[PDB]
Design a protein around this ligand. Sequence first.
Ligand code: HEM
Ligand code: HEM
Ligand code: NA
Ligand code: NA
Ligand code: NA
Lengths: 306, 307
Amino acid sequence: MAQSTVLPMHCLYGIFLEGNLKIQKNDQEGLKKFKDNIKKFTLELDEIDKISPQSRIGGAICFSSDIWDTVTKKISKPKELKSVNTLSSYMPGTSQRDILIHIISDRMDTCFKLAQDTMRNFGEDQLDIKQEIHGFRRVEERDLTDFIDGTENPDGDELRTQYGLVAAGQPNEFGSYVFTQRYVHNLKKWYPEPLSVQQDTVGRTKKDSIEIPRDKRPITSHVSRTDLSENGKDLKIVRQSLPYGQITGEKGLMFIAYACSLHNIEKQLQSMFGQLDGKHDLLLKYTTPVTGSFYFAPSKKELLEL
Amino acid sequence: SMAQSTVLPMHCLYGIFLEGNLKIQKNDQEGLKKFKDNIKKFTLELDEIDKISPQSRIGGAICFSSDIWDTVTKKISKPKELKSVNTLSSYMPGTSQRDILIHIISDRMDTCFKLAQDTMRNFGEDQLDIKQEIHGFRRVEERDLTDFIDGTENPDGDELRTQYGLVAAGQPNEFGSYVFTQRYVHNLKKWYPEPLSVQQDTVGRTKKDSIEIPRDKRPITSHVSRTDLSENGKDLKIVRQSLPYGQITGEKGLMFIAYACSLHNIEKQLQSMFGQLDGKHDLLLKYTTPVTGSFYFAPSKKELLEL
Ligand code: HEM
Ligand code: HEM
Ligand code: NA
Ligand code: NA
Ligand code: NA
């Protein structure tokens, strides 16, 4: 019932296309063509899945709060959706765009085919793409800090539905709130740090990703900043982030999270960027966010009913 | 009796291309010793990745220009045909001769990137000044971004790829290879609207199945007519390992690379494509532009370790 980037795990490739919609609010012919291109996307996902099951292909189209009432008069706007630019007073790099296309695959050739076919369908007359990122998994699923990324991601369809998708029975059920944020790593500053400093920074051991006990790591360790609870309930999220970039140039982490509630993501951002106790995440000494956007990925049904 | 491991294998899904200049000076014997230690580490890490990830079909080569040859070795004789590609600048655009090429191929990006990253960390910025890093990837049906299949007439199998790709046994520098790299930027806004008949006239094969257009029905300036060359009844075949690269919404094209037993096999095709043989240019050059270019020699594994 959901679009197909939230529940599956361990993709090897991801393509991220973020940009703005060029169709105006009352161009009904252009908006009909735009929705025909959305339909073609969902059909091509199915066709690639049938021909290349080994790809474990997945894809989602997601919309910002600012563009919501341009693309639909029928579906109610998700209750928590807002522009990420409202965080610009404390979080650098915000760059809210209208549209996200996120495609995942275990093969680059099918990842790229769907991304390219989709962009050719929409065309430069409908989409103004501001960012295109080719993410790829590294050996042992390590981020470029060379720590394993993903250890405490929720596992399995049951938990990833609970934390990644709007609950059944609620408005916009089986959609997801989405946050994207491109980080540029400063590995020249990170590599010389002793293992003890690197593990204090993250909050887990480097070789095996064993959690360091809460009382033995700083409260500004990354795990202490992001493992948060409210009213005895964990504010978990579903991350699909991947490394990207050039060995001899700019590189980092293309962060993306899917969540049942935007609050689960935003409270972690308040924590990491010093807005809850005046202290920043230790990881931010070594990496910098340079883009940012909030979106909502509708359910498959609402995507086709816009 | 072993070549470096990027010439003979076929159908890689990923390739990383690192091209740049050597910062070690001819007299710096301690620096050259460390440079050669890092070369040995590259050959050892290739073996280790092959052991741990046989599914990657990993391959790698380090290749040297004629300008840098006598800096890196006093012992191995310079390959007799090697020269700088900048000597072609009077007729071929985009020449940019560099000292060193590192070419890594894999069926998985994670092991491709691991070897490339580890290798660049070993050499470091104080030894290598990298001018270009390209992440190539195979597309569905092995099509170039023109959406024609690329590779139909590449030689198949170890025997023919040894014949056309490697210096012959018994010759100086046996089992090394002459190498040519050239990055192309495609003008797909210009190419996409062209009628199918124009596209097939340009390449010289059919788009759907890569069936050769009969010679009598295709232009002498078609790409296949320009590159299918012979001399004294012998075909001047080469071993291509080119891959697409780039951004859907930005700059994209083909990262061209060829390996050959003789630089002449490559250079005569360049003379053909760029108008030096008969004044006529390859039709493909109306839709794509070369923006880098370099000639190198990839030594045999033995000569690589004995520089
Ligand atoms: C440079 C950017 C980032 C890097 C390199 C990074 C890396 C990591 C690593 C290594 C872990 C530990 C392994 C794991 O459990 O996954 C982790 C955990 C986590 N990260 Fe990040 N992360 C980054 C940014 C973010 C951001 C922006 C958020 C939230 C919006 C986030 C949320 C989390 C969460 C929720 C966990 C799991 C915490 C737990 O319950 O134990 N991370 N991250
Ligand atoms: C934009 C750059 C280029 C593109 C898109 C391109 C594309 C192609 C295509 C589609 C084919 C036909 C299928 C095949 O047999 O592989 C082909 C054949 C070939 N290409 Fe290229 N090519 C390019 C540049 C070059 C260059 C620079 C050379 C030589 C240095 C070269 C040498 C060849 C050769 C030798 C063949 C096979 C000819 C035969 O014996 O039938 N190509 N190329
Ligand atoms: Na692939
Ligand atoms: Na792979
Ligand atoms: Na590239």
